[model samples]
Target: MQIFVKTLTGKTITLEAEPSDTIENAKAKIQDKEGIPPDQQRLIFAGKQLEDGRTLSDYNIQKESTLHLVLRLRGG
Candidate 1:
């Protein structure tokens, strides 16, 4: 399955993946391209947080969905 992801740092990119692929799988690629650690990456969709262990399909992420990638901000 293919999906669109918009990063907070830049424009959206297309990811070619399987429906069963975990968010961590996608985060690995994002880490490669964005140089952001997996632990620092946060994925948001449908007004909620997306989990790393959860499958993309588990979040009801279809062709209609778009994931926004942002840094998982920490407190001072």
Candidate 2:
């Protein structure tokens, strides 16, 4: 399966992985590419949070589905 990640900086990245890839796995990949940490990450798919320990398959994501991982801003 393929996963698409979008950062808060408006940068998008795509990668191929197995359907078993969990949200955490994708988060780690994003961290590697964007130098962001999991604690500061918030993932959204179809306008819902991609809860931890949930696999891409669980969300019905396709082989080349895009998942958004936006960095949450604080201190408004």
Candidate 3:
């Protein structure tokens, strides 16, 4: 399936994954693209926290479905 992931930097990335792809796998992809750690990544789908081991299939995500990923930043 193709998912749209939005970064905190306002960059949008489109990726294709199998039905067995888990949120952690997606997080790794995002980290590779944005150079951010997994701990610093926040992924939300339909206003709920995406569990680590949950796959896209668990969420019933269809092909070309979009998922929003937001990063939280801390300042001094």
Candidate 4:
């Protein structure tokens, strides 16, 4: 399915994902295209933060859904 990811900068990106895929897998995809490491991408869907161990299906993510993306800060 195609997923829409909106960032804090007001920019959005399109991603392809499967329901059975884990959230960490999704982050890896984002990392591949956006060059943002999986550890730095925080995905939020339906107002809940997507965990690394959970699958998209576990969160009831649907096709063409929009997920909020926030970057994680490293180092103080």
Error of 4 at 16 (Å): 1.1
After superposition, candidate 1 runs with Cα above 4 Å error: 62-76
lDDT of 1 by residue, 1-76 (tens): 5566666665566767766778889778766766767776677765678776898788776655554444442231
The lDDT of model 2 is: 0.71
Please give the RMSD to the true structure for each candidate, in Å. 3.1, 2.5, 2.5, 2.8
**Order the candidates by lDDT, highest first — what do you get?**
3, 2, 4, 1
Clash numbers, per candidate:
0, 1, 0, 0
Best-matching candidate per lDDT:
3
Which residue pairs overlap in candidate 4's backbone? none
6-75, model 3: which lDDT tens digit per residue?
Answer: 6656788777787589989987887777787788777777667788999877877756555554444333
Which lDDT value does model 2 have at 66?
A: 50
Residue 39, model 4: Cα distance from true site in angstroms: 1.1
lDDT of 4: 0.70
* Local accuracy of candidate 4 as per-residue lDDT tens digits, 1-41: 88767654555677888888898888787677677676656
34 Cα displacement, candidate 4 (Å): 1.6
Position 73, candidate 1: lDDT:
27
User: Whole-model lDDT for model 1 versus the true structure?
Assistant: 0.67
lDDT of each: 0.67, 0.71, 0.72, 0.70
By summed lDDT, which 10 consecutive residues of candidate 2 come out lowest?
A: 67-76
